[PDB]
């Protein structure tokens, strides 16, 4: 196979979703920090360039009416990546795309917390993308973890799926964000919540005809500043293991992450319109929206009746290995440190990526 960038409209072919319905019958959310004005222009460029019907969007000011929802320029790249990858992975159609904008002028992490809260209180988006995070110990120290976990618990109970990127620092999430730290390993919040689907990252190889070839762990090593670029994965030091993860034997009594993984290597990343220009972008920030778009298709195939899927993923995939592409090669550290991929569930990549048509057939037969 070859490593190259991909138009997001290629993700259905790659993950075997072409025979599924589009997400035209499912509403999807994206959590953002600040506004999305340029992102909506980039989204217009995206659907128009690809010859697709336009996407119905709404932007939601989730905090104070007098908050700061100005565009964050760097942020627009993230909301571009998220929106274009969702719509591409969804087959080119979503019922509506809702941008839940965090106020930037709010104290502490309260703007972000209120963005999550609004998405749950409104309960209109079935699937919500979160391509962000930070050291879980930091979130824990200031009470943000506890506050936000309550919101995600309510989401899961009401049948909403939050998808959360596992991180881009490999095992070194709490070490100056990504500086190698030997055997000291850590994870990202909110991926470590048991109430969300945590999504890790792969290196995606395709055949010359554009079909799936194989996936390895996302690990692109150190950048010029000496920071590691790799999939987050490991276990929470705070969150207890939810019962469905007991199928992964020989692991501690903690929430293990990620659950599943999709394309994240920049070298195999998505081609995204950003301030009018095409850029090749990776990260677990890519992997999460691919899951969101694909999962939204399965919702549309099932009348939006699929509840929070963590328990079902673990029972189905452990008993049915054909539902995934099992990542077996690579590690999410540096210098001989970090976790290794292997057969079945592993810390870099979880169960690996989903084969959507096979998963769809499984759900038809067994439910989810």
């Amino acid at each position: 196979g070859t490593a190259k960038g991909h138009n997001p409209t290629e993700f259905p072919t790659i993950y075997d979703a072409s025979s599924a319905p589009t997400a035209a019958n499912t509403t999807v959310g994206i959590i953002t920090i600040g506004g999305v004005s340029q992102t909506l222009q980039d989204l217009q460029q995206f659907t128009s360039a690809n010859g697709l019907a336009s996407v119905n969007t709404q932007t939601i000011q989730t905090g104070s009416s007098n908050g700061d929802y100005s565009d964050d320029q760097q942020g627009q790249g993230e909301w571009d990546l998220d929106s274009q990858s969702i719509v591409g992975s969804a087959g080119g159609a979503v019922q509506q795309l809702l941008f839940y904008m965090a106020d930037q002028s709010a104290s502490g992490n309260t703007g972000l917390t209120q963005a999550f809260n609004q998405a749950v209180s409104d309960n209109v988006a079935k699937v919500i993308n979160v391509s962000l995070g930070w050291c879980e110990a930091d979130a824990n120290a200031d009470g943000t973890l506890q506050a936000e976990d309550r919101i995600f618990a309510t989401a899961a109970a009401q049948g909403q799926t939050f998808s959360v990127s596992s991180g881009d620092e490999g095992v070194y999430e709490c070490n100056n964000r990504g500086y190698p730290d030997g055997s000291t390993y850590s994870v990202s919040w909110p991926a470590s919540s048991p109430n969300v689907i945590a999504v890790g990252g792969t290196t995606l190889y395709t055949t010359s005809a554009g079909a799936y070839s194989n996936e390895t762990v996302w690990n692109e090593g150190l950048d010029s500043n000496g920071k590691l670029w790799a999939t987050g994965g490991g276990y929470s030091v705070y969150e207890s293991k939810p019962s469905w993860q007991s199928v992964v034997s020989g692991t501690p009594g903690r929430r293990l992450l990620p659950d599943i993984s999709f394309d994240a290597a920049q070298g195999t990343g998505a081609l995204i319109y950003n301030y009018g220009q095409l850029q090749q972008i990776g990260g677990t920030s890519l992997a999460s929206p691919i899951f969101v778009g694909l999962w939204a298709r399965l919702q549309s195939a099932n009348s939006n009746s699929l509840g929070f899927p963590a328990a079902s993923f673990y029972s189905a995939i452990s008993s049915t290995p054909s539902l995934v592409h099992d990542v077996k090669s690579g590690n999410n550290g540096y210098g001989g440190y970090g976790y290794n991929a292997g057969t079945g569930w592993d810390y870099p990549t979880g169960w690996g990526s989903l084969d959507i048509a096979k998963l769809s057939a499984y759900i038809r037969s067994n439910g989810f």
């Binding site: 942020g75 993230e78 992490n109 391509s131 995070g133 677990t284 920030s285 999460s288």
Partner: peptide
Amino acid sequence: XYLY
């Protein structure tokens, strides 16, 4: 936080 960080954008991933």
